[PDB]
Amino acid sequence: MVDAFLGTWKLVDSKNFDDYMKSLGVGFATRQVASMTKPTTIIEKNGDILTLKTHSTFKNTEISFKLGVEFDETTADDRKVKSIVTLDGGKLVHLQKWDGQETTLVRELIDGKLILTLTHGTAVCTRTYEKEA
Ligand SMILES: CC(C)Cc1ccc([C@H](C)C(=O)O)cc1
């Protein structure tokens, strides 16, 4: 049911995002900007290439990848990371590694909503998204 992730998703709730960003070394001025927008995330597929786009006023980003194939990514906060996206049951797991550390960005569909859990050590952030019509 990978296809249930496809489409356009809008942020409707957040918890611990500011704490998560602080845990990655994102400065207060940038955290303030990042938190005061409700981003849109577009997930699309073309053959075996997936694309994830994030649109806001903090930044626009786009990554393209194949499931299970490591890729280079430069995150919204300017980390150069080694990334991989996998499917673990119903969880779409985006792992970012750099400099001996890591963070996961996990997406799961619960009751039709897309729950994005961001984990960096003990910092855990929940970002709740609703599908656009
Ligand atoms: C450190 C931070 C700026 C990286 C980051 C983490 C999550 C998201 C998602 C799409 C969101 O804002 O929900 C965007 C960018």
Short mmCIF file of C-alpha atoms and ligand atoms in Angstrom, two decimals:
data_model
loop_
_atom_site.label_atom_id
_atom_site.label_comp_id
_atom_site.label_asym_id
_atom_site.label_seq_id
_atom_site.Cartn_x
_atom_site.Cartn_y
_atom_site.Cartn_z
CA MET A 1 0.00 0.00 0.00
CA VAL A 2 3.01 2.34 -0.78
CA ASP A 3 0.57 4.21 -3.09
CA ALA A 4 -1.38 5.58 -0.07
CA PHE A 5 1.59 7.94 0.60
CA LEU A 6 1.25 9.49 -2.87
CA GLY A 7 -0.33 12.94 -3.11
CA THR A 8 -0.26 16.36 -1.51
CA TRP A 9 -0.19 16.77 2.26
CA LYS A 10 -0.63 19.85 4.44
CA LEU A 11 0.60 20.30 8.03
CA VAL A 12 -2.29 20.44 10.58
CA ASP A 13 -0.39 19.78 13.89
CA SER A 14 3.11 19.79 15.41
CA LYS A 15 4.79 18.80 18.69
CA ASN A 16 8.47 19.13 19.70
CA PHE A 17 9.56 20.45 16.25
CA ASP A 18 11.45 23.40 17.85
CA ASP A 19 13.15 20.93 20.27
CA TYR A 20 14.05 18.61 17.33
CA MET A 21 15.57 21.52 15.32
CA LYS A 22 17.54 22.72 18.41
CA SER A 23 18.91 19.14 18.71
CA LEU A 24 20.37 19.42 15.16
CA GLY A 25 22.08 22.79 15.83
CA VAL A 26 19.49 24.93 14.03
CA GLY A 27 19.80 28.46 15.45
CA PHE A 28 16.86 30.28 17.14
CA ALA A 29 16.33 32.77 14.31
CA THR A 30 16.00 29.91 11.72
CA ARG A 31 13.80 27.82 14.12
CA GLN A 32 11.43 30.81 14.45
CA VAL A 33 11.00 31.01 10.65
CA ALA A 34 10.72 27.21 10.20
CA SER A 35 7.95 26.98 12.85
CA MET A 36 5.72 29.83 11.72
CA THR A 37 4.78 28.22 8.33
CA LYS A 38 2.51 25.17 7.64
CA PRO A 39 4.43 23.33 4.92
CA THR A 40 3.03 21.26 2.05
CA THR A 41 4.67 17.91 1.22
CA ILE A 42 4.16 16.33 -2.22
CA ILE A 43 5.04 12.63 -2.60
CA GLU A 44 5.13 11.36 -6.19
CA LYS A 45 6.43 8.33 -8.08
CA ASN A 46 7.56 7.81 -11.68
CA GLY A 47 8.64 4.21 -12.30
CA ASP A 48 10.87 3.24 -9.38
CA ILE A 49 11.88 6.87 -8.69
CA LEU A 50 10.13 8.53 -5.76
CA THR A 51 10.16 12.31 -5.29
CA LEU A 52 9.43 14.19 -2.10
CA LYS A 53 8.91 17.94 -2.33
CA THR A 54 8.43 20.27 0.61
CA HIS A 55 7.04 23.73 -0.06
CA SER A 56 6.99 26.63 2.40
CA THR A 57 8.28 30.21 3.05
CA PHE A 58 11.36 28.82 5.16
CA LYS A 59 12.56 26.92 2.05
CA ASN A 60 11.53 24.67 -0.85
CA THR A 61 13.28 21.26 -1.04
CA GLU A 62 13.03 18.30 -3.39
CA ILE A 63 14.69 14.89 -3.18
CA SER A 64 14.44 11.98 -5.60
CA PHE A 65 15.45 8.43 -4.74
CA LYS A 66 14.86 4.73 -5.25
CA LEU A 67 13.72 2.67 -2.27
CA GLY A 68 16.73 1.03 -0.69
CA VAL A 69 19.42 2.94 -2.64
CA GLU A 70 21.67 5.37 -0.70
CA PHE A 71 21.73 8.96 -2.02
CA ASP A 72 23.38 12.25 -1.19
CA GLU A 73 21.04 14.90 0.31
CA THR A 74 21.48 18.50 1.46
CA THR A 75 18.79 19.16 4.05
CA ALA A 76 16.72 22.29 4.49
CA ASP A 77 19.06 23.27 7.42
CA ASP A 78 22.17 22.75 5.13
CA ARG A 79 23.36 19.38 6.52
CA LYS A 80 25.09 17.30 3.83
CA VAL A 81 23.95 13.77 4.70
CA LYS A 82 23.96 10.22 3.40
CA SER A 83 20.32 9.16 3.05
CA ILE A 84 18.25 6.10 2.39
CA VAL A 85 14.49 5.59 2.23
CA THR A 86 12.98 2.24 3.04
CA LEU A 87 9.57 0.66 3.61
CA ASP A 88 9.33 -1.18 6.99
CA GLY A 89 5.81 -2.59 7.08
CA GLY A 90 3.63 0.47 6.73
CA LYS A 91 6.36 2.94 7.68
CA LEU A 92 8.20 4.97 5.00
CA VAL A 93 11.55 5.50 6.78
CA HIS A 94 13.94 8.25 5.69
CA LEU A 95 17.33 7.78 7.42
CA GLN A 96 19.92 10.62 7.31
CA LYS A 97 23.53 9.90 8.46
CA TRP A 98 26.46 12.31 8.88
CA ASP A 99 29.49 12.80 11.07
CA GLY A 100 28.91 9.66 13.15
CA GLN A 101 25.27 10.52 13.96
CA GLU A 102 21.82 10.03 12.42
CA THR A 103 18.16 11.07 12.38
CA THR A 104 15.07 9.28 11.09
CA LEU A 105 12.01 10.87 9.47
CA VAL A 106 9.30 8.19 9.60
CA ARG A 107 5.94 8.51 7.79
CA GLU A 108 2.96 6.31 8.66
CA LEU A 109 -0.75 6.57 7.69
CA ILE A 110 -3.08 6.44 10.69
CA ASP A 111 -6.83 7.05 10.21
CA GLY A 112 -6.13 8.64 6.76
CA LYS A 113 -3.62 11.22 8.25
CA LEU A 114 0.08 11.11 7.55
CA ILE A 115 2.08 11.06 10.82
CA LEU A 116 5.73 12.19 10.40
CA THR A 117 7.90 11.24 13.38
CA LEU A 118 11.36 12.86 13.48
CA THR A 119 13.85 11.20 15.87
CA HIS A 120 17.31 12.55 16.76
CA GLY A 121 18.66 10.86 19.88
CA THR A 122 16.08 11.61 22.60
CA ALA A 123 14.43 14.46 20.56
CA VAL A 124 11.16 13.10 19.09
CA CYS A 125 8.90 15.38 17.03
CA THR A 126 5.48 14.53 15.65
CA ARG A 127 4.29 16.43 12.55
CA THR A 128 0.69 15.65 11.52
CA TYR A 129 -0.37 16.07 7.86
CA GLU A 130 -3.82 15.91 6.18
CA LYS A 131 -4.29 14.94 2.53
CA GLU A 132 -5.38 17.68 0.07
CA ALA A 133 -8.46 16.98 -2.20
C1 LIG B 1 15.94 20.63 10.78
C2 LIG B 1 14.73 20.75 9.89
C3 LIG B 1 14.63 22.16 9.30
C4 LIG B 1 14.66 19.63 8.84
C5 LIG B 1 13.22 19.34 8.39
C6 LIG B 1 12.45 18.43 9.10
C7 LIG B 1 11.13 18.13 8.76
C8 LIG B 1 10.46 18.78 7.76
C9 LIG B 1 8.99 18.38 7.52
C10 LIG B 1 8.54 18.27 6.20
C11 LIG B 1 8.15 19.31 8.20
O1 LIG B 1 8.51 20.58 8.36
O2 LIG B 1 7.28 18.74 8.63
C12 LIG B 1 11.21 19.74 7.02
C13 LIG B 1 12.57 19.97 7.31
#
